[PDB]
Amino acid sequence: GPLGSDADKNDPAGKDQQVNVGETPKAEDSIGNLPDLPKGTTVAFETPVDTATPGDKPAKVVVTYPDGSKDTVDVTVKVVDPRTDADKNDPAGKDQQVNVGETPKAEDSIGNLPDLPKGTTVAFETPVDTATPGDKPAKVVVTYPDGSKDTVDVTVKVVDPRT
């Protein structure tokens, strides 16, 4: 019947690429075997890739051959945030007051817990000594959901209730 099309002859290969938040990915970087394909073959994303948020993005690369025939390739574009949760957040430390013998909670030594990501945890680097009154220096370790950590310097004021 007719002589075959360029798409009838070739099969383009999908390739996963990695980019940063705000970076625009190139279709060429999503195709492995571009030299196996004919000279003059162009590659483009069917849908311009969204890189405003991190995460694995689904994409379609349209392969237009010199004769006009086209092939569609399904790929994944890995979008990553170069800035960690520790870069994206600033914990507001609070100096807390307790009585002699009371155990202080690290939660009560950080005032902006909801401003921090969901799943973030707070603990004292070293347990606070409350056996005697006075201003006890402490460090609250803020462990973010991405694994990153911030460290806040606070004061635990220990008071004698019979004074």
In whole angstroms, the N-to-C terminal distance is 104 Å
What is the overall number of helices?
2
* Main sheet: strand order: 1-4-3-2
Strand content: 35-45%
Q: Rg from C-alpha positions?
A: 28 Å
Order of helices and strands: HEEEEHEEEE
Give the helix level as a range of percent: under 10%
Give the overall shape, derived from the CA principal axes: rod-shaped
* Main sheet characteristics: 4 strands, mixed
Kindly name the structural category: mainly beta
Number of domains: 2
Number of strands: 8
Q: If you had to describe this structure to a student in words, what would you say it looks like?
A:
The chain is mainly β and 163 residues long. The protein folds into two domains: 82 residues, no CATH class; 81 residues, no CATH class. Helices cover 5% and strands 36% of the residues. Strands 1-4-3-2 form a four-stranded mixed beta sheet, with no helix packed on it. Strands 5-8-7-6 form a four-stranded mixed beta sheet, with no helix packed on it. The PDB classes it as structural protein. Keywords: Rib domain, bacterial cell surface, immunoglobulin fold, profile-HMM, domain atrophy, structural protein. It forms a monomeric assembly. The entry is titled "Structure of tandemly arrayed consecutive Rib domains (Rib2R) from Group B Streptococcal species Streptococcus agalactiae".
